[PDB]
Design a protein around this ligand. Structure first.
Ligand SMILES: [Cu+2]
Ligand SMILES: [Cu+2]
Ligand SMILES: [Zn+2]
Ligand SMILES: [Zn+2]
Lengths: 151, 151
């Protein structure tokens, strides 16, 4: 009953690994098994649409823009922590990438359930995430680098 | 009703910052505000005794050995994840240290409560933590580098 999600690099078009999702007494667990990522902490979020295609914006291209914004079932219109209820239910803890470019440190999302995740897409950004909309919106994750649809 | 914990470097004897503890619907939140630490992921645990003094072992010195082993109220005798019940209730998520040596990424402990933490000590190790006793016990955190008693 556990889920496996294939992740692809939006830039190169090549796969960077897989993320396994599981449900437990305390929430959903995201177990990463990725590679070819830049070291550091990465913005890690569940997005609205179940797609990783591109989108257009004022004449420019947005890799993984079809996924839309962050998963916000309660229409909170705010970005925040994984343990605060007044923000995107899709706000996951940041994803850590080792010096060798690997990601295998599991993360927990207390406000989520497996059933509701299907049809949505997991997203990995280039910048980090300070879990706020200040001083940079959406935690400063910036561009989208890796993406995967949860089927 | 929130707690502030002073942390000291066991080696140099100098303070490296403070960690703020708070309680919320989903557990205890550890908000770090440290510095002078080596980049990477660090083993982060709550230990048994409320002390950071040294201890002796077979003729050798153990910095922060007086704190004892990991907090294990249920006497599970196993090291594991922060979201599994059959292991040290004191198993916290690993602590991330930036390239500039700062630690400010908050962490959540679902199985803990503030009241029970007092009298214990927060510990920071040199190695990481793979949340298991294999292939290295206690997640491979090795030596203790920073410590703080929760009063
Ligand atoms: Cu995102
Ligand atoms: Cu420890
Ligand atoms: Zn968000
Ligand atoms: Zn432990």
């Amino acid at each position: 009953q556990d889920l496996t999600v294939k992740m692809t690099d939006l830039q190169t078009g090549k796969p960077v690994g897989t993320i396994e999702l599981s449900q437990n007494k305390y929430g959903v667990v995201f177990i990463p098994e990725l590679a070819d990522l830049t070291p550091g902490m990465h913005g890690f979020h569940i997005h609205q649409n179940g797609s990783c295609a591109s989108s257009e914006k004022d004449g420019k291209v947005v890799l993984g823009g079809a996924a839309g914004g962050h998963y916000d079932p309660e229409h909170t219109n705010k970005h925040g922590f994984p343990y605060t209820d007044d923000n995107h239910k899709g706000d996951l803890p940041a994803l850590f990438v080792s010096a060798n470019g690997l990601a295998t440190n599991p993360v927990l999302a207390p406000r989520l359930t497996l059933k509701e995740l299907k049809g949505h897409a997991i997203m990995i950004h280039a910048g980090g995430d300070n879990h706020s909309d200040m001083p940079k919106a959406l935690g400063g994750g910036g561009a989208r680098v890796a993406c995967g649809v949860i089927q």
